[PDB]
């Protein structure tokens, strides 16, 4: 007759969160202004004010992406969810998709592609793709879309994109780019680089809480989407509905799903923040911090996974795991003795490296100092064969 | 040579949000404790502390759902996203899905079902489904899964579920229930009612910000999922990955996607809140407010769309639009002159009704007072043929 479950004891306690300095590939710490944004009251998801904040975020995405694409908006999901929305609306079953698979991300792009109806232009962690090699790929399969990771956060590789725009439009192919870890930390120009679909996450250099993602479509990728004959497998990610709600259409905004309002307040303020600083300074800040961090690490004796500075993702550095060390001890030592988070590999780079992230408000010399003296400490106290 | 887009002027201004009393079908206003949760700093998405908060939320979902299902967790998306995750992992292409389509929600369930590979047991806004009629449906198509809306927020209909558990297990059919608008506001017992998949939203009676959703699978629906031969079209919604991250497996938590950490802090506190109050009181609060509100409205002259109190969703009441009135004026009048939000129809009920929502901390006599004197005012000042 009764209620099977009783109120959980743990919930009857107060929520208590540790203070951790997030210096890994994401999420990153939140500036005071973003936290304040997080604690505001709620407004109607379809109110005139919500739309206004929505338009500002759009102008915000056009600026950080550097595009004028009308089809620009926020995906109410994390990084993956933006990738998936990209693929599920552009790729129609059996389409030939060439994938720059040199990190867990390309790996993820294949999986999604397979699942929805693919050519694994494979590499090894640490490698990138030459303008040369992609023609070779565009050659055989003449795919309708190519996938490239700008900032490969699982390997630390910064991937060059100048020209590819054309090398793809050449073969009547759409260019899809992942700038989840690169946005705000290295130069990127969607239009001038002829990228067709660009997506990014909110919790990396932008310092917004995780859960939302940014996306933009060129008139080219747009036309393919509005004239496919199949309806994309997903309703939650349907750009036709999505675009209309975000005001990208000629029609009145129609109810699709309830946007994550509080997260939008936060994303808006994080876009305001980089708009006040300016992309060029943010680019200079990250480059400088990444340079400082590289110096210190080599001084500690560790060597950089990515041999060649031009190919090093400023926002995420991949150090090679030291000699007779179990990386796990190092990571544990740092979070245990200094309250600092840093990671190990991910996918192909698993156990081969340590990843140190420098993002937005955390990409400072001060934190490079802290993670250096943390790492050094680990190095002298952690077991060693 | 330059940057095409310049920092948006609007973003250079401070974020300013109006104070609105949200009394429509969602989202709802946030108690002080949830807002505080929203403004906390970030922690690692895979830290031991994040997992602890994750387990508490799980215990939290088992309690509000009233189940012990190990396969219980949060979907990093809104209500739809939980429905979609439900359907995309249970239904395999060409499966026969019987859908209680009596509101925009069944409508949504068909669309998703079609998109992924369906029997529209149609009704009219205001109607519900008799234990009788579903056998008739389970009869013809002998579908592997049935979809039922517990709280139809677009029509105001509270749908009875006692027995259906069996009337479905009878025909070897899985029972899928939508308790996005009913959870916390009317009695629901997942196990005792033999529901197989139950999902709810975070922004309705729970008073958490929108963007996350709750889901639970019975051992039955679980087995079908872990032994389908096709991989679900979605990677972001793959329960195999999802379950593992949420600690429902025998394996170490493996990185899938970055959970919306800040939103989880808030959802945890909103679960703590109802755990302190108790489901039975929350059920009593909403029933009582809905009763008070019904009285007042009929006193104002308006009539209730749903004729029969037993079928009236406490959390969302559907009033019929009055005589020579343009509903739009009424809704505008209320948000314009009293800062209060209430809605009109949605889908099948479009323009036929007004929807007044009573949710969680907003389901009070005080707010019933406010929306009554708001509505009355509208009634005397808005145009009338
Ligand atoms: C972190 C990261 C992702 C994943 O974003 P999520 O929000 O965790 O799904 C995707 N791509 C790149 C390059 C990343 O660094
Ligand atoms: C509001 C509502 C939904 C939609 O939830 P979203 O988070 O806006 O996608 C689904 N079902 C019911 C019964 C609802 O009331």
Swiss-Prot record, chains A, B:
Modified residues (N6-acetyllysine): 220, 229, 307
Effect of residue 213 to L: In HP1; loss of alanine--glyoxylate aminotransferase activity; loss of dimerization; no effect on protein stability
EC number(s) reported in the record: 2.6.1.44, 2.6.1.51
Family matches, as Pfam families: Aminotran_5
GO biological process, one term: Notch signaling pathway
Compartment annotation: Peroxisome
Disease linked to the protein: Hyperoxaluria primary 1: An inborn error of glyoxylate metabolism characterized by increased excretion of oxalate and glycolate, and progressive tissue accumulation of insoluble calcium oxalate. Affected individuals are at risk for nephrolithiasis, nephrocalcinosis and early onset end-stage renal disease.
Name the UniProt record assigns to this protein: Alanine--glyoxylate aminotransferase
Organism of provenance: Homo sapiens
